[PDB]
Design an enzyme around this catalytic site. Structure first.
Site, short mmCIF file in Angstrom:
data_model
loop_
_atom_site.label_atom_id
_atom_site.label_comp_id
_atom_site.label_asym_id
_atom_site.label_seq_id
_atom_site.Cartn_x
_atom_site.Cartn_y
_atom_site.Cartn_z
N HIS A 1 -5.08 -1.50 6.47
CA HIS A 1 -5.96 -1.59 5.31
C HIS A 1 -6.09 -0.23 4.63
O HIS A 1 -6.01 0.81 5.27
CB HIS A 1 -7.34 -2.10 5.73
CG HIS A 1 -8.43 -1.75 4.76
ND1 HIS A 1 -9.17 -2.70 4.09
CD2 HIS A 1 -8.89 -0.55 4.35
CE1 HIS A 1 -10.05 -2.09 3.31
NE2 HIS A 1 -9.90 -0.79 3.45
N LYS B 1 -4.89 -10.13 -5.77
CA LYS B 1 -5.71 -9.04 -5.26
C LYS B 1 -6.58 -8.44 -6.36
O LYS B 1 -6.22 -8.48 -7.53
CB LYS B 1 -4.82 -7.95 -4.64
CG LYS B 1 -4.54 -8.16 -3.17
CD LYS B 1 -5.63 -7.55 -2.30
CE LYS B 1 -5.35 -7.78 -0.82
NZ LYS B 1 -5.96 -9.06 -0.34
N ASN B 2 -7.72 -7.88 -5.97
CA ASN B 2 -8.64 -7.27 -6.92
C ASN B 2 -8.34 -5.79 -7.09
O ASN B 2 -8.87 -5.14 -7.99
CB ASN B 2 -10.08 -7.46 -6.46
CG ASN B 2 -11.06 -6.62 -7.26
OD1 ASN B 2 -11.77 -5.78 -6.71
ND2 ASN B 2 -11.10 -6.84 -8.57
N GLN B 3 -7.48 -5.26 -6.23
CA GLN B 3 -7.11 -3.85 -6.29
C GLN B 3 -6.03 -3.53 -5.26
O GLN B 3 -5.83 -4.27 -4.30
CB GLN B 3 -8.34 -2.97 -6.04
CG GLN B 3 -8.37 -1.72 -6.91
CD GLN B 3 -9.18 -0.60 -6.29
OE1 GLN B 3 -10.27 -0.27 -6.78
NE2 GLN B 3 -8.67 -0.02 -5.22
N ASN B 4 -5.33 -2.42 -5.47
CA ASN B 4 -4.26 -2.00 -4.57
C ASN B 4 -3.82 -0.57 -4.87
O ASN B 4 -3.95 -0.09 -6.00
CB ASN B 4 -3.07 -2.95 -4.68
CG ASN B 4 -2.31 -3.08 -3.37
OD1 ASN B 4 -2.30 -4.14 -2.74
ND2 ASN B 4 -1.66 -1.99 -2.95
N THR B 5 -3.29 0.10 -3.86
CA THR B 5 -2.82 1.48 -4.01
C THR B 5 -1.52 1.71 -3.25
O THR B 5 -1.49 1.63 -2.03
CB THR B 5 -3.88 2.49 -3.52
OG1 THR B 5 -5.08 2.36 -4.30
CG2 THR B 5 -3.35 3.91 -3.62
N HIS C 1 0.83 -1.20 0.00
CA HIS C 1 0.00 0.00 0.00
C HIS C 1 0.87 1.26 0.00
O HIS C 1 0.36 2.37 -0.14
CB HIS C 1 -0.93 0.01 1.22
CG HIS C 1 -2.07 -0.95 1.10
ND1 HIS C 1 -3.06 -0.84 0.14
CD2 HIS C 1 -2.38 -2.05 1.83
CE1 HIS C 1 -3.93 -1.82 0.29
NE2 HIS C 1 -3.54 -2.57 1.30
#
Length: 133
Positions: free
Chosen positions: A128, A38-42, A15
């Site tokens: 998170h 993963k379906n998404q991340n930043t 993250h």
């Protein structure tokens, strides 16, 4: 949260990343924590300290928790990265592609009690990432 990285220190790992490489590979060392993708991340281009300091700011209602306020939005706009699983239905960290989208804004991270063996100085730490606004 692998047996090598804590829940927090491991959170910023994926993250958070000053220089976010190709979402394709950048999702390697990370996903290595699990067997699925993963379906998404930043990945926010900033240090953990700059993030932990945000947990001490006026908290607010998080998106993932419309009935709880255990997170805090960044006060200062910082350069972060937003990637998404461009492979819907694909469960292979070997062929799991990820999208890349640069941007400079706040970030919603869920801070919680950490272990005195990982974050002695900082009381709370992110575990998170809701989103970046």
């Amino acid at each position: 949260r692998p047996p090598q990285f804590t829940r927090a220190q491991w959170f910023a790992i994926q993250h958070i990343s000053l220089n976010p490489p190709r979402c394709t590979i950048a999702m390697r060392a990370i996903n290595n924590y699990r067997w699925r993708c993963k379906n998404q991340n930043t990945f926010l281009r900033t240090t953990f300290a700059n993030v932990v300091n945000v947990c001490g700011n006026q908290s607010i209602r998080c998106p993932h928790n419309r009935t709880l306020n255990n997170c805090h939005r960044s006060r200062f706009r910082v350069p972060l990265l937003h990637c998404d699983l461009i492979n819907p239905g694909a469960q292979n960290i070997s062929n799991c592609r990820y999208a890349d989208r640069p941007g400079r804004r706040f970030y919603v991270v869920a801070c919680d009690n950490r272990d005195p063996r990982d974050s002695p100085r900082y009381p709370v730490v992110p575990v998170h990432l809701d989103t970046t606004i």
